[PDB]
Amino acid sequence: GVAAIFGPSHSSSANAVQSICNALGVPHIQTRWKHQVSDNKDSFYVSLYPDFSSLSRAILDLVQFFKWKTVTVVYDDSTGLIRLQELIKAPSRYNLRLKIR
Amino acid sequence: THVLRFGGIFEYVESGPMGAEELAFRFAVNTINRNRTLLPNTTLTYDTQKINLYDSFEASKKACDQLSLGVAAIFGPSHSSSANAVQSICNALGVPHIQTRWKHQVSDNKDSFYVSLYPDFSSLSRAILDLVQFFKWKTVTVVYDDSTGLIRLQELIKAPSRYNLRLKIRQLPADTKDAKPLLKEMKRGKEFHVIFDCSHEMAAGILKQALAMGMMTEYYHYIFTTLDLFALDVEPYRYSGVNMTGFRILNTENTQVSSIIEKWSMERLQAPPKPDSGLLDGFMTTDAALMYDAVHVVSVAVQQFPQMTVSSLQCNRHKPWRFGTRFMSLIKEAHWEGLTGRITFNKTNGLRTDFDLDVISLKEEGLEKIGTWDPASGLNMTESQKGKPANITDSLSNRSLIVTTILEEPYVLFKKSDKPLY
Amino acid sequence: QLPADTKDAKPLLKEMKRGKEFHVIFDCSHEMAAGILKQALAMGMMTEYYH
Numbered sequence A: 001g002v003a004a005i006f007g008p009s010h011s012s013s014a015n016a017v018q019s020i021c022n023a024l025g026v027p028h029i030q031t032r033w034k035h036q037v038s039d040n041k042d043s044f045y046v047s048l049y050p051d052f053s054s055l056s057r058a059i060l061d062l063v064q065f066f067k068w069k070t071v072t073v074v075y076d077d078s079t080g081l082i083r084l085q086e087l088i089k090a091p092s093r094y095n096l097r098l099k100i101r
Numbered sequence B: 001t002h003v004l005r006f007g008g009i010f011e012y013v014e015s016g017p018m019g020a021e022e023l024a025f026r027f028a029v030n031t032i033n034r035n036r037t038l039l040p041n042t043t044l045t046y047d048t049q050k051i052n053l054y055d056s057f058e059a060s061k062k063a064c065d066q067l068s069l070g071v072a073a074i075f076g077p078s079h080s081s082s083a084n085a086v087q088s089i090c091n092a093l094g095v096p097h098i099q100t101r102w103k104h105q106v107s108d109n110k111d112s113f114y115v116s117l118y119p120d121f122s123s124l125s126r127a128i129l130d131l132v133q134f135f136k137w138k139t140v141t142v143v144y145d146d147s148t149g150l151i152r153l154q155e156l157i158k159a160p161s162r163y164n165l166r167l168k169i170r171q172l173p174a175d176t177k178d179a180k181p182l183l184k185e186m187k188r189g190k191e192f193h194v195i196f197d198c199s200h201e202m203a204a205g206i207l208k209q210a211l212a213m214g215m216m217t218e219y220y221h222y223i224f225t226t227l228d229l230f231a232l233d234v235e236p237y238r239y240s241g242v243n244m245t246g247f248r249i250l251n252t253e254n255t256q257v258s259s260i261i262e263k264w265s266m267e268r269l270q271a272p273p274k275p276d277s278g279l280l281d282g283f284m285t286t287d288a289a290l291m292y293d294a295v296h297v298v299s300v301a302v303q304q305f306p307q308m309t310v311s312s313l314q315c316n317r318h319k320p321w322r323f324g325t326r327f328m329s330l331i332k333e334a335h336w337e338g339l340t341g342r343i344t345f346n347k348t349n350g351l352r353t354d355f356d357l358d359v360i361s362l363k364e365e366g367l368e369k370i371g372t373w374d375p376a377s378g379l380n381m382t383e384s385q386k387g388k389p390a391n392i393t394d395s396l397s398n399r400s401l402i403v404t405t406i407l408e409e410p411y412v413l414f415k416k417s418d419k420p421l422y
Numbered sequence C: 001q002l003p004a005d006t007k008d009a010k011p012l013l014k015e016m017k018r019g020k021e022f023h024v025i026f027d028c029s030h031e032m033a034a035g036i037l038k039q040a041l042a043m044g045m046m047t048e049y050y051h
């Protein structure tokens, strides 16, 4: 008997607990970014982490304030491309020259 | 042994025909039961259940329902949110979990009991990257549809750090295939060499927007990352002069492999048509070709192991299955000349990273094979064509005109200097 | 000249691509101007280079 679930903090472990909280009704408060699938029809959760859909505007505002033309974006795990996808689509509109490593 | 029940977790079409992957799982069991050559004294029985494909609580309940009455494999829920939930149930219980669809393997997964019959994109992304170097490109415009499509092509995005490609990564609109404000930007950017990463439903849909825009001509090349170009209607696009290169793994040239495809259109016999979509007859696409292989590769491993008496395992009181560790290796070192080429798994993972592709392209006579990719060799193109004599001219050039010239005073004499003269 | 009555004018329009002929002055009826332009779309000839 609980009134919340506080966010097991993974991408594979959080998605499994989220759909349990959706079917049972209890809220699922997350504190870490997660690859939220475009059609997971769940709204019984809140995600208290600054979303990389908006935080990667801020890196994009910062790399055009310093006027960089030769950025060299370096991630560590393959879910880092989802985090910075608003920055990787930026040479299609600005004059950045990315080089992802 | 005896009955040897399998398990299946499939989609929820909701008052129509059953899915493409579900008939392919039910056509494969009915074929092996009647052919007494493969699996002689067994009789395979299937158990299929229905989930929403997006609910990892229904996929976890309908897995532990099948694990309760006894299965010997779980043939995949085929979606990233719910495949990872059934994978870890199959890990804690022992029973294998045969997958026919690419999901993101999380790096610290530590899961032993799964194999994936979909060709892994560590090898496919090194096969687009050799078609952007055989065709000698410098400007590519990789287009995907959802945010997972960056992970599928991550060995294509890490390419300008080794070569001279200049990627211009774009994204289709959210789900609507009215991608004209995308394609208006691709005309003004002079982007001729697009590398679409759609499905075969959207590669039939974006190309009707690329024909309404003035973009299906001889100036545009299109590499597709779908293994279903052969089931694509290309009758409007054949005379344009376009180039539509891609891949297919399904052996539509072999006799025993092609004959099952017309048996597939015979047993289906309705294949619910949509003549304004841009797709051909069903043709047993790669999503359903692999499920026909997934039953046979396991059927090899039960042929080589006649000790399986499938027992009733719980889900809340989980106990590892008795023959779980022994039987999982027989799936993983199995080999089968199936529909999709040879089937061998990467013995570290359980991922197909060794597989034969064909490099089919669009010509004026249809959509024809031009080569063959092979991960050991590379592009073995069968380029070697005659349809028109060679492009402009060959090279006659400098030749440097060597001159026989002796040294002699003030005609030809050496120079004296301080620094060396060469 | 278009082929006799059949609107399958693709061997005409193949010659008009190789001749670099961008500025065509069709003298059809409105039944054939609806018919040749579906052959000029199946050929790669309905773009911004053609008037």
Ligand SMILES: *[C@@H]1O[C@H](CO)[C@@H](O[C@@H]2O[C@H](CO)[C@@H](O[C@@H]3O[C@H](CO[C@H]4O[C@H](CO)[C@@H](O)[C@H](O)[C@@H]4O)[C@@H](O)[C@H](O[C@H]4O[C@H](CO)[C@@H](O)[C@H](O)[C@@H]4O)[C@@H]3O)[C@H](O)[C@H]2NC(C)=O)[C@H](O)[C@H]1NC(C)=O
Binding pocket: B122, B123, B126, B127, B130, B346, B348, B349, B353, B375, B376, B377, B378, B379
């Ligand atoms: C599945 O099992 C396979 C083998 O059984 C494991 O091997 C991986 O896959 C290939 C096969 O060797 C490797 O990729 C190849 O690397 C060559 C050079 O890359 C080197 O570069 C770095 C530094 O730049 C080195 O440090 C490193 O050691 C690499 O070896 C490329 O030239 C190859 O390209 C050619 O082969 C591909 C086939 O994939 C074809 O498209 C063409 O013929 C192309 O010319 C290729 O890129 C890869 O490095 C191997 N290792 C890893 C870790 O991926 C896999 O490990 C295993 N899969 C897993 C564990 O997921």
Ligand SMILES: *[C@@H]1O[C@H](CO)[C@@H](O[C@@H]2O[C@H](CO)[C@@H](O)[C@H](O)[C@H]2NC(C)=O)[C@H](O)[C@H]1NC(C)=O
Binding pocket: B218, B241, B242, B243, B244, B245, B361, B362, B363, B364, B365, B370, B386, B387, B388
């Ligand atoms: C790319 O497209 C070109 C046409 O734009 C193809 O070249 C033609 O191939 C057909 C084969 O039947 C013939 O008409 C000629 O050999 C070619 N025509 C011209 C004008 O060159 C080419 O084969 C395509 N290449 C690939 C890899 O798809």
Ligand SMILES: *[C@@H]1O[C@H](CO)[C@@H](O)[C@H](O)[C@H]1NC(C)=O
Binding pocket: B035, B036, B037, B038
């Ligand atoms: C049974 O399968 C074999 C290959 O395993 C194949 O030749 C055919 O489909 C079947 N054999 C006969 C004699 O029908």
Ligand SMILES: *[C@@H]1O[C@H](CO)[C@@H](O)[C@H](O)[C@H]1NC(C)=O
Binding pocket: B001, B040, B041
């Ligand atoms: C038929 O079943 C028996 C079990 O009594 C088994 O030993 C035999 O191998 C089976 N036949 C074939 C051809 O496998």
Ligand SMILES: *[C@@H]1O[C@H](CO)[C@@H](O)[C@H](O)[C@H]1NC(C)=O
Binding pocket: B377, B380
């Ligand atoms: C490529 O395919 C041809 C076709 O028969 C074959 O002879 C050849 O051995 C293959 N490999 C290479 C490296 O050319």
